[PDB]
Design a binder for this molecule. Structure first.
Ligand SMILES: Nc1ncnc2c1ncn2[C@@H]1O[C@H](COP(=O)(O)OP(=O)(O)O)[C@@H](O)[C@H]1O
Ligand SMILES: Nc1ncnc2c1ncn2[C@@H]1O[C@H](COP(=O)(O)OP(=O)(O)O)[C@@H](O)[C@H]1O
Ligand SMILES: Nc1ncnc2c1ncn2[C@@H]1O[C@H](COP(=O)(O)OP(=O)(O)O)[C@@H](O)[C@H]1O
Ligand SMILES: Nc1ncnc2c1ncn2[C@@H]1O[C@H](COP(=O)(O)OP(=O)(O)O)[C@@H](O)[C@H]1O
Ligand SMILES: Nc1ncnc2c1ncn2[C@@H]1O[C@H](COP(=O)(O)OP(=O)(O)O)[C@@H](O)[C@H]1O
Lengths: 337, 366, 333, 359, 338
């Protein structure tokens, strides 16, 4: 896939944040560009690591998740603060763990596909045949090739490791061999980290990327800042993305025989509700949309069974009825939303 | 496939009141069945709607989670969030959850083997009495004397093992507990409010970051197998009097879409809890004293003054919720529970005068 | 066991002196065990053991009641100091060490059975026959049933884990203990054990703190409460003689081994109890444990010469007690 | 052994400290008295533990060492401060490991006799193959005992025969019986864990199950601590035994204070004890062909030298005698090879010559 | 070995220069080993090794005496830094010692196998595979793995460096290490995968500068387990000149044979050696005194140009003279910052 083909696929899931989509696409394209090179340059070239920057919940992780899911690559998210108190080599360990017929012959074959120890026996042959078809030395060694060639690692909240300054910067030095390249031992095999791609992310409000150790700053060639989502983006996130949470709730109630429909003004007042809570108390980003939506739909989701065969409409009046009383009280909103 | 009203109606048989918490947990369990009906793509994108219970201790937050999992026959575990402040790894939650799912699926599988094994064990022991060369007449004549009762007597126990071992399938069982954990698993994290936010704030919020992969989804290794946490349901609870859910790390606040506050229990609810729930503690004491041949009966005014006694202690000193009912009842019944052997064949009646006699002197002194 | 609660206390009176309320409280818990088994399938799960919290000064027999109670029921038993977990070891070790005691308990008891049949069918033959007679799956699984059904655990000095820095570590131990009483499942090399029906006995002086200082989930898991009274001088005189295999009876048979006959006068027993009481008041009160230190100091001269005194009848009188003791009791230093 | 026989044997090694000798003798004698009792009392009776008290180096440990060596019992010395940092159960584990090597080497001593007889009968079969002892059978038995792969083969038969004679289930289980019935443990510097007060008293609670009785798992087997005897020791100048936790104070029924050694005690310790350090240096130089002899005034000035150092700097007790003696004899001990066939005399003038400049 | 104490010192003089008191002290300990075996069954248990405490500034040869002493006795040896345990279990000392004794007795057993195997392999005949099968056929593992245990228990030697640094907060952890070391000297038994070893008869050598602390600051139980005390003197400029040449396989002799490998012949003038010792002394006085270790840093700095060109210099005879030493050094010794 060309870099524009990657961004266009990411637009199907993430909304906006095109600069982060363009930056990740360059890294994945360099993978294919490297394989076309000669024996010497393939060793000298190393992945272009990315450092995402921005407030929480704007989709930094989702880009890394959909990117690895787009490439079918191994992926893991690790909190950098986990190591302030486990060995750093566990990152690669957990990454590898995630990585002509007779007439009676047809007459019985028909009754078999139609359905029918006998019934238990069909399941045991799937194991014996799939084991006979599978190649374990080509499989356990494939996950190693999938990690080494295609592997991806997302390091969240890297800005928080910038008394404590020795332990904080000590985690950076422990992370250093993985990016500069090294070899880690695992029960599944011996993995090399040279060509693994990495994505670090942090708000960087307390610290700056310059505060990172110099050896780490040079191993993160690509830098990108992700913009904060607005109320208008909340309305888009509720609907536009494939399998959006509103589409999920609609199909969920459809299973009960109920038909949910959201008005544009009803969607607009949900985004306004999630925005008010982030401003009134604490800003969690687009994550607030999930808490507000379930609070609005809790009465329908409970009653949907008796509501089978009915068409429910979520309007602006319905949103204000179940929400504005909760959003008006900030003491309650921190608990309930 | 129970509908959400069927879930609360079942929960009303045990928990009293707290309907909003019942409605909230029912929505999460129903989304499980609603997800399976969806297509291949949506089943991955949809994730469990996690709940945050809030309220004073002892109002039934855990009992809702306990009866909900018991209602679904799902694996369940309660974990204290403060255990990780000191230390143990956070991954142990899934490990201990699978160990409960293993024993759960195993004992339930024994319930299946308990039947078939007795039939195959009988056919084995009849081969020694009537060796083979429609059941034979002597085959039934011995089969009758066997069921009537009778090394020989030890032999029937050994065949239950060999037959249940011959009947059990370990690859469908140990892999069943994994499917029970991944699909149906439930985890209750008590006192999550105590890990909210300088020195402790790093160790407190560090536990939140350690918990983060389990809710965002991850893979944990266990001796029983490799489990994925993506579809596991979680229930966090806390009083949140010192802190508020907004004090939680932002990645955690968005992984708890459903929030509910549980109301403080009243004196009237205490009277209902003593009697109304199936196998209520009063019914338990009644059958226990029946074992000794004694008949316990509680008057409505006697039940009313026990609930008033437990309420006064929670207000006079510390409010433990409905847990106070257990301490008060045993203190009232301790004299009968000691004498029940000698009281066999007698009808004892717990009245308002009896409750005040054994209690009011104790409740009067804080 | 089907013993009625009065039969339990009467058996406990053979060892412990006084503290009847603690005896009555433990008997109710053991009787509820037999009462539960007669119930139906539903109530047997809902009913849970009535846990007891002993309260009182050290050395008044809190542990002995739990020890003799488990010994009376032939149940597995373990004593654990709650402060051990302040530093560290996992709390689940309680069930692990309990099963290890239950394993050795059911094994040595199973040896007593195979001891009989193997001698008929038969040192080497005792092993082959007992192995031929034993069914290890009924034994290692018996200790599990003995722990789950009959198990008992005594948690000493629980008052010291009550409630800023230590209060987190102190109350943290309470939360770690919480699953065991509320019920849970612990994995052991011997098997998988469930804690739902295990009985527990917590004890503490509670002079610094109070049971109300315990976490609320823990206060509701200890339905039965009892306070143990301080021992008097008269109880010391009873402890010296009345209990089966009392320390005076132990010294008598010990000297009987050497051919010597010890006999204690009532006034001689009376002045030993007065001696142990004065030391507890003059310096520090250790409870009935003082009786052990005072008696050995009195008998050290007889115990030393007992070989040469074979064939003699020695009498411990009030004059003998004052001769070897009062000079020592007079100096508190 | 009766308690007077124990103290009299202890006097052959330790000098003075009779009260500590009388106290340890009562504990070892209660062991034999318990076995003679009935089934019930043998369980109820528990060892009478001892708490030694006094300044360092006065022989507290030597009493425990010679006591266990007198009883052939397993023994271990453990520093209580080792657990301040970090498990207490290792005490029983290391105790059994010493008991394993103790019973094993002692079992080799038994097989040492019979195996030489059976090994000789094996080696005579190759020299005198069989078709009253034969003429050549004795003729080779004589040349064999006179001395002579051949020479290597006699060692291999000692293993096969000692293995054929030994019963390992009676051995690894014997060390367990030696630990449970006869075991002894010396806990040095117990006073330093008295009321850090949480970590100090926490070690006491960790030690509590071992004295109150418990069961510890080991690779060699499962051991019970109920009947093991223990000896705790401490200077108790900073703290007192009353500062110990109450459950620990009642598990130490016997208390004894050991007196500080005097200059007169030093002179006795140098000579009177069996295999005293002066006797050791004498036999060592005798190996080189030299004769050491110490004058009474020369012994008197060595004791005065060790006393002055303990007073002038730090008092280490009788341990000072070892450092002073080796410093005096270092010139002889080096030259002992060339001094063979000579009689050296250690006099007061010799002691002052090599020492007083240092003191 | 039956060597007398003077024979031990005379052999030590072939390697170490001076420090005769430390040589006499170590010789008395090794001789007591042979003196003990001649005693009866009783005295052999009661007598215990006379442990030594070396004292002096760093680099004066405290370790070299312990190394050459064990190498002289063919005994197992290990050097352990006492500060390693301030933060591993102390029992690892005996474990690592047995691991050195295992490889010591094994390679030495190969020296007996290297000969016989070649004869039996010739009779069989691939030549490399038969050395294994024959050496495995000739080797006795129960006499070997048990030999290293006898070598550790009877002949074992341990050197504990910088013991003076373990003499309120650190004082507990510092003195805690002493108590952990105490059982090893008083005698004990340690479990190892190779077997069960007893420490009663092992000899130990502790060393420290003792400028911050004194041996009296050691715990009393440890002071009595170190009967022999010796102080090692600081090396002079004249001693540096001797250390460069006199000792067998001296660093000057090592550099000469190294350049001989390239076909070059190195020769040092007496004045050239004299100006090397003067160079190392000036650095120790001008900045920090590291002892004789300064000789290694100065020599390699002087010879770095020859060591670089030695390939192209094959067949040539080099002479290190006073003019050559001053040319490559005095400019560096001048500037103390460099
Ligand atoms: N641009 C976006 N498109 C789709 N979903 C989003 C977007 N931004 C946030 N989300 C939702 O909010 C959550 C974002 O969390 P995460 O990406 O881990 O935070 P961050 O991006 O700060 O690392 C995800 O669960 C995701 O479903
Ligand atoms: N509504 C209720 N119905 C029935 N029992 C209750 C109720 N509330 C509390 N209880 C009893 O009190 C205890 C509640 O403890 P728990 O539910 O763990 O506290 P919380 O709800 O604060 O987490 C349980 O043992 C339960 O038997
Ligand atoms: N009432 C009693 N009857 C018999 N022995 C007693 C009694 N009280 C104390 N003892 C003796 O004193 C000791 C009591 O210790 P323990 O019971 O552990 O203390 P606590 O009761 O405070 O937990 C035991 O060794 C026991 O032999
Ligand atoms: N009374 C004594 N008799 C013989 N040797 C003694 C005596 N007192 C001390 N020693 C010697 O001094 C050392 C005493 O150390 P130790 O007994 O461990 O000290 P403590 O008695 O304070 O525990 C031993 O090496 C021992 O040889
Ligand atoms: N007297 C000496 N004879 C020979 N070499 C010595 C001498 N003194 C020091 N050395 C050399 O210097 C180094 C001394 O280090 P070491 O002996 O470990 O120091 P220390 O003696 O302080 O323990 C060794 O590498 C050794 O080669």
């Amino acid at each position: 896939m060309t870099p524009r083909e990657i961004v266009s696929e990411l637009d199907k899931h993430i909304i906006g944040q095109d600069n982060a989509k363009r930056s990740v696409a360059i890294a994945l394209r360099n993978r294919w560009r490297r394989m076309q090179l000669n024996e010497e340059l393939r060793h000298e070239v190393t992945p272009k690591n990315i450092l995402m920057i921005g407030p929480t919940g704007v989709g930094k992780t989702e880009i890394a998740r959909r990117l690895a899911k787009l490439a079918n690559a191994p992926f893991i998210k690790v909190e950098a603060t986990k190591f302030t108190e486990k060995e750093v080599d566990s990152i690669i360990r957990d990454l590898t763990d995630a990585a002509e017929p007779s007439a009676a012959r047809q007459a019985f074959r028909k009754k078999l596909r139609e359905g029918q120890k006998i019934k238990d026996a069909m399941k045991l042959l799937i194991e014996e045949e799939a084991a006979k078809l599978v190649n374990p030395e080509e499989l356990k060694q494939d996950a190693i090739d999938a990690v080494e060639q295609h592997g991806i690692v997302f390091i969240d909240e890297i800005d928080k490791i910038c008394g404590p300054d020795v332990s904080r910067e000590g985690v950076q030095r422990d992370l250093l061999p993985l990016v500069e390249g090294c070899t880690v031992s695992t029960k599944h095999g011996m993995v090399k980290t040279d060509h693994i791609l990495f994505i670090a992310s942090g708000a960087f409000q307390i610290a700056k990327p310059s505060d990172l150790i110099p050896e780490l700053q040079g191993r993160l060639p690509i830098r990108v800042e992700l913009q904060a989502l607005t109320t208008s983006d909340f309305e888009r996130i509720l609907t536009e993305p494939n399998a959006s949470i509103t589409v999920q709730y609609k199909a969920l109630m459809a299973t009960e025989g109920v038909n949910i429909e959201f008005t544009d003004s009803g969607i607009k007042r949900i985004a306004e509700a999630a925005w008010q809570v982030n401003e009134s108390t604490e800003n969690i980003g687009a994550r607030r949309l999930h808490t507000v939506l379930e609070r609005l739909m809790e009465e329908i989701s409970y009653d949907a069974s008796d509501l089978s065969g009915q068409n429910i409409t979520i309007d602006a009046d319905y949103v204000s009825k179940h929400l504005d009383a909760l959003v008006a009280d900030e003491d309650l909103s921190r608990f309930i939303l």
